[PDB]
C-alpha cells in the first residue's frame, strides 16, 4: 500500500463516533488515498461514469412512479409522463439521454484502459469487475429500452431474447422461460421491468467493489510507472491527496461534459435515438429501417456480419456436423468480441505497462479503436455489400487484435525508454 | 428543407399557425385520423394554440365520447382526449407523427404536398413509401377558411397542420428549450468556476 | 475566497435544482388538477336517507333528513360542540348551528364531504353513533344530526361544499 | 460426519427447493397455455395480395401467389438451397421443394408463420429482397417465392402451421 | 477491540487475490469475530431478521414480475399470481406473513435488547442504526400493504398519508405531495410502489452499518460482562469464534422459527390478515370493522386513545392556543412513543448493564413488555370504554417507563452481584 | 359451525360437493353474482370439481361476452373469465366472498341459511351484519335436480355452494395443503440434524 496520513479524531465527538463506528476513518481513507499526480484527461471518465449511475437510478425512481409496466398502459404512461407530471419530459429525456452518456463514458473509460495497461498485473481484477458492469450495464440499458413498449422496444425484445433460443439443446427452453409464453408479450413486459429496476442495484454494488479495488493496487498513470512505496517522502514526490486536488479536476472536468449533455437535453433531446419508437409495438409488423441502439451497434454489426455465404462459417458449419450454423457462430462471435477483451490481461504478454512506450501498439490500438467506430457505422448500414465486407474485415481484426496482434508484441517488441519515476514524468 | 418559427434554439410555436393548423385538423384530418394521448385541455396551454378556457370548452363540445363510468354519449370536456380513430381505411395516428418520421414536420409537409396524380388503391407520392401511399390526396386549395385571412392554399394548410402536429408532438418544447438554456448558461458559469478554483489547487504545484 | 463562495454556492444551487426536481414531479400532475363541478339528481332520494357520490376522489353525502333529526340538530347549543364552525363555504364565517349547515331552510338537506375530518375515513350514517348522525369507524369519531363533530379524535365538523339547488330535483356541487 | 452430509445435502435441498421457486414462476403460466385453434376466413384475398393474422402472438401470412410465383418456385432446385427441409409440420418429414410448401396440391396457397427462423423478426413481402420474397429487415435474411431461405443467418424456411381449408373459401390454423 | 486472529493467504488463488482485492480477508474476520461465548437464545434474532430480509427481497423482486401497479388491475393481478403462476399462491402468502415472521423477530430482538442493555454505551450507535431501520420497516410495509388495493390498502392510505395532513402550517402541502393529488387515486399506488421496490434495499445497506457497529464494539451478552480485551488467551477464555459455534446454533434456531413459519404459510395463510383485503377498495366505504396489521396494533392503540375527551388533551389544547388538538396529539403521541424508544440511551442513567441484575428494573420492563401486548390487544377492540381507559393507562406507562421509571432506577437502584467475567459465567 | 371435508391440515375438498356447488353456483347465484376472478378452463383443474375437457368448453358456452378485439357477442371459451355482474339489485362478487368474510363458508351458509321470514327492502337474517340483509332469500327445496341424486334441501344447496365457493376463492388449497406438508416435515427434519451437528459442536466446550 501507498504511504498516506490516516485519519485521527479530535472533536469529542469524532473520538465518542470513532471508538463505535469508525464511519469516519472509511470516508477519510477513500478521499484521501494518495493518486498519481500525472494523471491526464482521460483518468475523469470514472467520475462521469459514477455520475450517471447515480443520475440513473434518481431519475428512474422517480420515472417509475407515474409508469405502468402493462401492454395496455406502458406507451401512453410514458406519453403521460412526458405531457402531464411535473418536469416529467425533462426526466424522461435525462434517463434516456442518460443511458447515453453512460455508454459514451464505458468506451472511453473502457479504452483509455485498453491503452495504458489498466488491465495488466497487478490490476486484472478491477478490469474483470469493469467487464461484469459492462455486461449488467448492457442487459440493464436493454430491458429499460422495452420499458416504452414502442415498435423498437418489441422487435428489440423479440430479438434479444431470440438470441438465448440460439443454444443448442437448451435454448428453446431459456427463451421460453425469458419469454414468460411463447411471444413477447405482457408477462415480458412485466419481468424486464422488475430485473430494469433492480440490475442498476446490482451494478452500484459492483461499482463499490471496482473502486475497492483499484484503491488497493492504486490507480494508474500515463506512465504505467508505479507509485513509490520505499518511504512516505518518495510517495508524497509521486503523488497527490485524490481530495481536494482531482476531485476538483474531476468536478470541473464533468461540468464541461455536462454542458454538452444539457445541451443536448435541450435541444436535441431525439438526434441520438430511433424515432420509430415513437410508434406503438406492433406485433404483426417488423419497421423496415430497424437499427438498434448506437451503443449497441458494433456488437450488432459483428452479429450480422456471419451469414451462410461466409467461409468461416461453412467451414464451422460443416467441421460442426450443422450444429453451429450461421444463426449460432453469429450470436457466439458477439459474445466472443465481449469475451476476449475480458480476457485481455491473459493475451497482452508485454511486459510493459503503459501503451505510451510502446511503438507497435500505438499503431494496432489505434486500429482497434477506428474498428470499433467503423463498425459502430455499418451496424447503421444496410447490410446489401459493401457494408458486409467492411463489417467481416471489421471483426476480424477486433479477434485478431487480442488473438493474435498482441500476443505476437509480447515477442516482437521494443520498448522505448521509460521515466524512472512519476515525480520525473510530471516535471516534464 | 421548408423552416418553422420553431427549429432552432431560438425558436417558438406561432400560435397564429397553431390554431390554422388545429383547424386544418378539426376539419379535414380528425375524419381519418385521431390523437389519443392529446388531451384536449392542453389546447389552453403556454407554449400552444393556447385557446382560451371557454373556447376550449365549446371546442371539446364537438366530440362524442361513450363515458366508461355510464354507458351513454356525452359530448366531450377538457379533460377527455382527442378521439381514438381507427377500423378500416383509417389513418395511424398522429400525435407523435412529427416526431416517429430530424425532419419531421418537413416530412408531413413533404407527404401532404407529394401527391402527382398517378394511381396503381395506392397513389404515387414524392415523400411516402416510396412512393405509393394509401392516402388519398386529402388537401385540396380553399379547403378552408381561416379567420385570419391567410390564404388556405394546400402549401400554407399542409404546412400550419404540420407545425400543429408538431405541437401534438413536444407539447413542452417551448419549457423544454427554455430550461435547457439557463442549465447550459449555468453549466457554463459552474464550469468556469471549477476552471479557476481548480487552477488555484493547482499552480502551486506546476 | 470569494472564488470560494461562488463555486460552494453554484454547487449548492444545482444540487437545490437538482432535489426540486425530483421533489416536483410527485405533485399533482396536470392531467389531476382538473376539479369540474358536477351535478346531483336528488328526486330520488327518500326521507331518511342518504345518497354517496364521488367528487374529487371522495364521498359526498346528500341525506334528506327527518323532522327529528332536524329537531335533534335544532336543540343542541353552540356550547356543548367541539367545533363551533359551521365548517360552511357557503356561509365561510357563520355559526355551527343546525340553520347554517343545510342548504335549505327548512333543514331537510344536509349536503356534506362524507370524510372524517379526523384523517379521512368515510363515516357511516343512517344514524349510526351515539348521536345518531355518523360514526367513523376508523378511530371512534360520532357525529349528530347536523353533521358536527361531538364525540372522538376529528378536529371538524363535516365540512359543507358549495353547492346549490337549480331546479328542485338537482344540486350542483362546485 | 454422515451427519455431516445429511445436513449439508439437506441445506443443499432446501438452496434448490428455494431457487426452483424461484426460477418456476417464470416458466408460462396457466393462463397463458391454451394454445387454441382457428379459422381465418381467406374469401378476401385476391391474387399477388398476402393476408396477416394474429396468432398466438405471432403473425401468419397466407399468400395467393401469382402465375410466376407459382413457376419461380417450381424452378429452384433442392440443391440450391441452405436449408432442404420444407419445415411443414403436416407433410412432416418432406423436403423443401415448392410442392411439400403450399396447402393446394396446385401451387396457389402460400401459408406460413410469418416469423424469420433467425431471431424473430417478421419479414416484409410483396417480393421484398432478392427474390421477391421476403425480405426481413432485421439481419438481412432474403426468402424466396416459396418461402424459402435464401441469403443471410436465418437457419431455416419459412415453417409451416398444422393447417387445411374447411370450405372452400375458409383456413383452419392449428 | 477483541484480541482475534488474521486471515492467511496459502493457496496460488489466495496469494494472488489477497494482493488484489482482500475479499477473503474481510469474510474471514466477519466470520470469525470471537463472540462471548454465553449468548442465548435471545441472540438468534438478529439472524431470523436478516433471513426475513433476505426472503422479503427475494419474493418481493420476483412478484413485482407478475404484478400491476394500476388501480384498474393491481388487485387482479394480486388475483392473477394466486391462480396462475407456478408457485404464486405461495410466494404470496410467503412475502405477506413474512413480513409479520419480520415484525415478530424485530420487537422480539428488540425487547431482548431493552431487557440486556444492549443499548447502553458503548453500543448507541448500533442502536440508532436500529431504530431507524425499524421506521424504514414500517414505512416499507405500510405501501407494501397498499399494493393490492383491496380496502384495508385504500383506506390505509387514506389514514396514514393523513398522518402528515395533522401537521399545523405545512402537513396540507406533504399530504398533496405525498397523495399526488386531492385524494389516494392511482397516483398514490404508483409512487408507493416504487418506493416499495427501493426502501428495503436502503434497509439492507443499513443492516450492513448495523452489523458493522456490533463488531466494532463486540456484541453484548446475557451478562452485560464485556469480552476481556488484556491479552488473546483470556479472549479466548470468554468468547468462540462466531464461525462454526453461533452460525450452526443460529441456522438451528432458524430452522425451528422456521417450521412454524411453514406451518402457518401452508396451513393458515390468512389467520395474521384482514379478510376484508380481499374486498376491492372502495372509494366511498370504509368497513365497519377496519383493524390494522397487528404489528401496527400497539401505536394504533396509542393514537386513538387521545380523543378531546382526554384531560391532558385539554390541557394541551388550551395551553398550545388549540394550535395542538386530540388530532395533532395523538399523531405525536404515536411518534413520540417510538422516539424515546430511540432516546433510551440517554435516558436510561443506571450504570449497571444488563438487566439480568437488577431486581426493581425487571419488574417495570415485565410491564412494558406486557403494557406491549395489551395495546396490541386493545388496537383491536373498538373505542367504547372500559378499552379506551386501557389504552389510556398504556400509553402512558409506555412514556413513564422511558422518562420517568428508567432515570429515577439511575439513582435509587442497587445491582445484585455480577460475575467477574463470562468465562465465569458460562461455568454455571 | 357445520363442517367440510376441506378444513383441517388433511382436508381435502369432495369433487361432487363441488360439482353441485357450481350447479347451485350457475342456476341461483349466477343471476345476482360473478365471479371475475374464475378463468372458465380452471373448471377442470385438479384440486378443484375437475369437469372434463369438453364439458367446460360445453358449460363456458352458456355465456355470452362482447368480443375486446371485436365487437361481436360469442359464446364464452374456457379462457375468459365467469361474468362480471352488477348495477341495481346486484350482490358482491363472489370470486372471494369465502376468504374475504376464519369462517368463511361457514358464514355463506349460516346466511343462506339464516333467512327468518320478516320483511321490511330489508329481510332479517340470523347471519348478516345484523341482521337485515338487502338479499331476498334466494333457495327454495328442490330449487335444483343434482345429476347424482342429492337431496335438494335448502342447507344441503347451502352447503354445495359454500363448498363451492371456498374454492373458488383458494383454488389451491391442496396444493398448498400439500407443499405445505412436505415443507414442515423437511424442516423439522432439517431442525433435528442441524441440532445433532449444533451439540456435537457444543459438547467439547461445555
Ligand atoms: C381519409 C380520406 C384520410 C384523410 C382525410 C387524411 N388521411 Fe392521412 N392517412 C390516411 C390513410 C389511409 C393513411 C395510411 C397511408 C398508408 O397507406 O400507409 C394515412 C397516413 C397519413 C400519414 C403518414 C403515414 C406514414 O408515414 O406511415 C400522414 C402524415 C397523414 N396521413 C397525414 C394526414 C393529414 C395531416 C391529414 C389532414 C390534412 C390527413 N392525413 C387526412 C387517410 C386519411
Ligand atoms: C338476486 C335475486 C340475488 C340472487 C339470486 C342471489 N343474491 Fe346474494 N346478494 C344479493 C344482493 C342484492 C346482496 C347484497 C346484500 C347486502 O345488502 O349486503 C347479496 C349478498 C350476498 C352475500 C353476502 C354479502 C355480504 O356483504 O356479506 C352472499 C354470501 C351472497 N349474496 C350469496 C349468494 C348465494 C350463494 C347465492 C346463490 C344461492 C345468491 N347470493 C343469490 C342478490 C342476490
Ligand atoms: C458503471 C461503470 C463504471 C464506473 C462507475 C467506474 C468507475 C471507475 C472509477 C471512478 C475509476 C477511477 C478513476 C478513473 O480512472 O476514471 C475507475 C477506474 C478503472 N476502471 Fe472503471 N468504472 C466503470 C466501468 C468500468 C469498465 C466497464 C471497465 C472495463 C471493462 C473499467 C475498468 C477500469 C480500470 C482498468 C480502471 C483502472 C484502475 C486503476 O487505474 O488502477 N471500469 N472506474
Ligand atoms: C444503469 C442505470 C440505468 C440504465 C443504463 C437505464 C436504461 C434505460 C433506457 C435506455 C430506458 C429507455 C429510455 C427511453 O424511454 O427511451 C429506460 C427506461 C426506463 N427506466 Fe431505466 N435505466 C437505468 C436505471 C434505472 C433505474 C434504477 C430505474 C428504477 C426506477 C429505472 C426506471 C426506468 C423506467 C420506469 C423506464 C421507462 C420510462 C422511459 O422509457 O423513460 N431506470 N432505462
Ligand atoms: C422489508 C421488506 C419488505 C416488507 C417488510 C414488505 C412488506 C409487504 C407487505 C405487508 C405487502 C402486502 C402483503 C399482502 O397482503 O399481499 C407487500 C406486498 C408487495 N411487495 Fe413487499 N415487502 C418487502 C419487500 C419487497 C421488495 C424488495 C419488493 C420488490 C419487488 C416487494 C414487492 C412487493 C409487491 C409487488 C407487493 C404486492 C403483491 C402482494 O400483495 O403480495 N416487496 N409487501
Ligand atoms: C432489519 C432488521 C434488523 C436486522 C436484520 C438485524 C440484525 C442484527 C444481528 C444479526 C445482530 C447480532 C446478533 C443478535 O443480537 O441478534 C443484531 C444485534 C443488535 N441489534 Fe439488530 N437487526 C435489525 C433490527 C434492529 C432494530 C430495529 C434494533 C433496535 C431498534 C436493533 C438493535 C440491535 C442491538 C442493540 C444489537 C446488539 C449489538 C450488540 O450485541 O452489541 N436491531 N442485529
Ligand atoms: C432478461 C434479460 C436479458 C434477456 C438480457 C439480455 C442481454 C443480452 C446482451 O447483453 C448482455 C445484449 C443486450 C447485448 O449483446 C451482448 C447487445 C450488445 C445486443 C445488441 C443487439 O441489439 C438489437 C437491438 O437493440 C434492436 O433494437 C430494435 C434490434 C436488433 O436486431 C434487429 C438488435 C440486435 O440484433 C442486437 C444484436
Ligand atoms: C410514502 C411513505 C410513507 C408516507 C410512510 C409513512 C409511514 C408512517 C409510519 O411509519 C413510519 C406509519 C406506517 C406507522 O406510524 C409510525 C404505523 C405504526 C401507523 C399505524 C396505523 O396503521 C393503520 C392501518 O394500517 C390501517 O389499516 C386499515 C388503518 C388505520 O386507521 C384506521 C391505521 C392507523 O390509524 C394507524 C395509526
Ligand atoms: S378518521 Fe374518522 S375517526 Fe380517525
Ligand atoms: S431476424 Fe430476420 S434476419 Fe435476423
Redesign the interface.
Known sequence: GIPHDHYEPKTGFERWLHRRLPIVSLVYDTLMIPTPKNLNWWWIWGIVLAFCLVLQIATGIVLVMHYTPHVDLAFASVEHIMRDVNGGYMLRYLHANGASLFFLAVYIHIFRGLYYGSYKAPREVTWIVGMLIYLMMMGTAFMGYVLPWGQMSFWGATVITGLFGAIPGVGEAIQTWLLGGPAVDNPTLNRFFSLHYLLPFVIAALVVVHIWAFHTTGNNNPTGVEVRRGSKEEAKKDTLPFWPYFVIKDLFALAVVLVVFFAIVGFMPNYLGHPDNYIEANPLVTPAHIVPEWYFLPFYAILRAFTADVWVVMLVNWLSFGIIDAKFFGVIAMFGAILVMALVPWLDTSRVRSGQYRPLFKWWFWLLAVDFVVLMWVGAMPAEGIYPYIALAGSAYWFAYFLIILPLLGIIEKPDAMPQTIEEDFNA | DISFSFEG?FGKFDQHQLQRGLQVYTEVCSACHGL??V?L??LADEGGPQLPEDQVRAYAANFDITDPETEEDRPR???DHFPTVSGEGMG?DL??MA????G?PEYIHAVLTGYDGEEKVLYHNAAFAGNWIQMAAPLSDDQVTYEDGTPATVDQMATDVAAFLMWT????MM???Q???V??I??????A??????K???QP?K | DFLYYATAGAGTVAAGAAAWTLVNQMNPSADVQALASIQVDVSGVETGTQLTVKWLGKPVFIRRRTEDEIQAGREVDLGQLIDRSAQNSNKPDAPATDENRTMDEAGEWLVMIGVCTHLGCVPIGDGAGDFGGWFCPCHGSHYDTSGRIRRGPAPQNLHIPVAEFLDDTTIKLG
Do not use: H, M
Open positions: 434554439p389519443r394521448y388531451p385541455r392542453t370536456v377538457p379533460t395511424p400525435s407523435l416526431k416517429a418520421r430530424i419531421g408532438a413536444e407539447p413542452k419549457d423544454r428549450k430550461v435547457g438554456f442549465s447550459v449555468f453549466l457554463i458559469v459552474l464550469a468556476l471549477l476552471y479557476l478554483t481548480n488555484k489547487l493547482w504545484i
